[PDB]
Assembly symmetry: D2
Homo-oligomer: 211 residues x 4
Amino acid sequence: PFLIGVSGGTASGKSSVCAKIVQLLGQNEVDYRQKQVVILSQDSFYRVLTSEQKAKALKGQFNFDHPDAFDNELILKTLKEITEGKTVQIPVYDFVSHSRKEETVTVYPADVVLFEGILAFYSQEVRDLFQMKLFVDTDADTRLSRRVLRDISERGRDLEQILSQYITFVKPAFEEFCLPTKKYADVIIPRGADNLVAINLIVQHIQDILN
Amino acid sequence: PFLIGVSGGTASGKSSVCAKIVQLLGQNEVDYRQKQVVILSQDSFYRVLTSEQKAKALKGQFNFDHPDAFDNELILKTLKEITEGKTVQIPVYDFVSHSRKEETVTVYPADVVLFEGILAFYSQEVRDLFQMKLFVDTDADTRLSRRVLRDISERGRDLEQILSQYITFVKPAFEEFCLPTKKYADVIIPRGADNLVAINLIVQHIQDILN
Amino acid sequence: EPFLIGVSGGTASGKSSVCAKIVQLLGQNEVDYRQKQVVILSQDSFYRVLTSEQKAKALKGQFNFDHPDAFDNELILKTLKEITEGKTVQIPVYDFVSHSRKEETVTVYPADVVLFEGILAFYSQEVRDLFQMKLFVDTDADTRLSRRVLRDISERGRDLEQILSQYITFVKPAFEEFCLPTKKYADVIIPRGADNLVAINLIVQHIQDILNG
Amino acid sequence: EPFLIGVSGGTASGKSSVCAKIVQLLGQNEVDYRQKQVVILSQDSFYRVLTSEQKAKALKGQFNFDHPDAFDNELILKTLKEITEGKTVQIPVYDFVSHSRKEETVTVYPADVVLFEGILAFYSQEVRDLFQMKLFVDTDADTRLSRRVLRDISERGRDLEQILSQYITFVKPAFEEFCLPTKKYADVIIPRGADNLVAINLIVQHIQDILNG
Ligand SMILES: Nc1ncnc2c1ncn2[C@@H]1O[C@H](COP(=O)(O)OP(=O)(O)O)[C@@H](O)[C@H]1O
Ligand SMILES: Nc1ncnc2c1ncn2[C@@H]1O[C@H](COP(=O)(O)OP(=O)(O)O)[C@@H](O)[C@H]1O
Ligand SMILES: Nc1ncnc2c1ncn2[C@@H]1O[C@H](COP(=O)(O)OP(=O)(O)O)[C@@H](O)[C@H]1O
Ligand SMILES: Nc1ncnc2c1ncn2[C@@H]1O[C@H](COP(=O)(O)OP(=O)(O)O)[C@@H](O)[C@H]1O
Ligand SMILES: Nc1ccn([C@@H]2O[C@H](COP(=O)(O)O)[C@@H](O)[C@H]2O)c(=O)n1
Ligand SMILES: Nc1ccn([C@@H]2O[C@H](COP(=O)(O)O)[C@@H](O)[C@H]2O)c(=O)n1
Ligand SMILES: Nc1ccn([C@@H]2O[C@H](COP(=O)(O)O)[C@@H](O)[C@H]2O)c(=O)n1
Ligand SMILES: Nc1ccn([C@@H]2O[C@H](COP(=O)(O)O)[C@@H](O)[C@H]2O)c(=O)n1
Ligand SMILES: [Mg+2]
Ligand SMILES: [Mg+2]
Ligand SMILES: [Mg+2]
Ligand SMILES: [Mg+2]
């Protein structure tokens, strides 16, 4: 399986870029079991929160941007099995309640796997599993604007709590943990999903692999 | 009169820095006519909008961040008279209605004048009237967060229109017109009003001038 | 119609080497001159002819070869336009050692893909719109200054102190004022220049696909 | 208690010259050694003693003098602490030419104001908290590389290629990893280094005020 790692800051466009790639590849018109290109999100691997942690999260006082927030062991284990051509089950994360669902997603063997997340390149062992590394680079202020609108209409958050959480944990964590991984990227994609030339370049490359 | 120019991006903390300086100098406990240090805002010199312009402004589709948005002639004329020790009248701008008020402010001769604005260093003639140039440097994302809260509670704006206006005009104008003037600053003050050491340095310097 | 790819980046960013590598990997350095499917055009080939006093200053590293005015922008646009029309063009040959245009020229026959590289390839809107793909080779300024020093001393017969003087006085200011503002027009940013094998192979594959149909 | 001012910035940013200018303008280069009211301490005075193989590597520009481990951080903290206690201290003298600590030393008597400058002056939290004011001299990396090259060749007897190698391999990476992250701790940022007369006079006036009472 050809693994492509995608990173970038929060709301940089990582998710929309991956979605557009599979969409342009016609994967949305293919049966779930027949998909040749699948998208795996790092957010699906957020650790289960403890009572105290969830309490803070509800107040926007928990650091979901720190490397420890993700179950790195599970991520590595899952990606390795995928590279081995095995079928795996991945967790389903609910941003609204800061928790997992009892339902999991079946990830069948695909020819190409897109793994995206704010800290997809943080771990060296994970990084070495990617045959290609893309980093979506979008200005911090632009990303904040996007996150505010997205979080309010999709993650059930409030403006003030969003800005507070962002300035207190998100911004600092981005500079300390995310930004430093940009150097590992092979190709930088500015702006995001509206960058059609960049997206089509990845699509053609993937299509070439499928053939 | 000792003129101090202060610039920086929107919501960088220019206004709060100047306010804190005069506050620490005890100027808030001095009668209006007796003030030795006065603050002049560049926003007071926004040009009067035409019908079409105001219509766009209401939609957040007018560029208030472009150099042309300010009456540069009036600014230069006013600052020159101030350097001449003359009493002048300055306009009063209402951000809520995107317009001036019929009432003006009397600016009496002061020993020290603080002139602050996003484009205070844009004009060379104006820039040369400043004996000291300060630039308040605060990260773009941090400034956006501040502007959103400020604009909503002080300028009668709506979140969506604020983000739209910011991404469409504010951000581009900052990079093209404001940021390039940072090189003219003598001293850079990071973060803003919470930077007590920096503020106290300016206060002591001004106090030295007053003596 | 020819597929034009614009490539920019600061001096010594790796632009030239990246383009050379791509063309080499495409096996074009084997194809007949008149059968070339992928060619490279350099913006430096269009540097203007210097006058007597200009060349004198250049000999002292006192001429600004980094300002848009240093290039014959009209000739660049006309040439690119003629290329998109499938016409054979004549390109000048520049000599960095003598700061002059050589008498010898390079004829470029109709190609399927054209790579145009230069420190200011994205400066002109008209030129930019002629590119179907825009790549920016991003390499830190301090890294590029190191590379430029070694290159100019060993290849362009320049003196160390003159290189640093020229760099601080003209190269750096012009890059920040005229080149940096154009980075936003690039579709893809390529780091580590010529050593970025993944990025290079990606472009090669894309071009090979365009050639196949 | 002595008023400590920490000063940082990358190599050749103008840190040393700024501090020297301030002290000169304060008329301290006239005051008796034992009557000095304002003194300057350099972090480079605390570079560690190199072993046989370390010095050999250093002679080839293969040793990392930019990593926090290159300095005797404990001696720095102890010395600063003793200074804040109003005690007379003994400071080592470093020789950049031989990569070694000299046998001669500089005695620093109780001062009212102390300037501590170094490429990593803000790296240690304990050290940072000892500063009542933190200044960062911000000068672009390419500008600093140019200055460093000229300085090392003419003052530290280094070879051009070795300087560039050392810079790309250690100086640049260490600056970005260890120094840049500390810039956020500075209270005031000073651009244009030693040529910034306004900023320098501002600091001088502030210090003179502290001395007057
Ligand atoms: N070009 C664009 N213009 C406007 N909104 C955009 C653009 N690209 C992305 N967005 C919006 O930004 C938000 C975050 O994008 P997303 O793709 O989820 O990024 P990430 O995966 O990096 O967090 C979404 O609400 C998305 O619709
Ligand atoms: N350190 C700070 N922490 C939180 N909010 C701040 C801080 N500094 C400024 N602000 C807020 O940011 C907004 C913009 O600051 P302002 O001083 O008006 O800046 P400017 O004059 O540059 O537009 C205000 O609502 C202000 O209260
Ligand atoms: N990975 C690398 N490491 C060190 N030097 C390099 C590297 N890649 C290129 N160079 C050197 O950098 C100089 C400029 O590279 P070049 O490809 O011509 O860039 P540009 O076209 O942007 O000027 C050359 O002298 C080249 O040998
Ligand atoms: N304005 C300037 N223009 C050119 N060179 C300068 C300037 N200011 C300082 N330099 C040179 O830069 C080098 C380093 O300056 P220095 O003050 O020692 O900085 P730092 O203490 O940060 O290493 C010296 O060789 C000095 O002569
Ligand atoms: N429960 C959770 C889990 C993650 N997050 C935020 O989600 C982000 C990562 O997702 P994106 O890449 O979709 O922005 C982080 O920056 C983290 O702040 C959250 O706000 N609440
Ligand atoms: N009528 C007006 C006039 C100015 N402005 C905005 O006010 C800003 C400048 O003020 P601050 O420095 O207070 O942020 C600009 O960035 C401009 O966008 C506005 O939003 N409506
Ligand atoms: N005669 C000339 C013409 C150009 N140049 C320099 O050549 C550079 C562009 O070449 P590269 O793209 O090969 O780096 C410019 O930065 C310009 O300074 C020069 O140093 N002498
Ligand atoms: N023996 C030594 C000790 C330090 N250094 C360099 O000296 C620098 C710090 O000096 P400045 O602050 O004077 O620039 C570092 O960047 C370190 O590389 C050296 O080149 N040889
Ligand atoms: Mg996402
Ligand atoms: Mg304001
Ligand atoms: Mg070339
Ligand atoms: Mg020193």
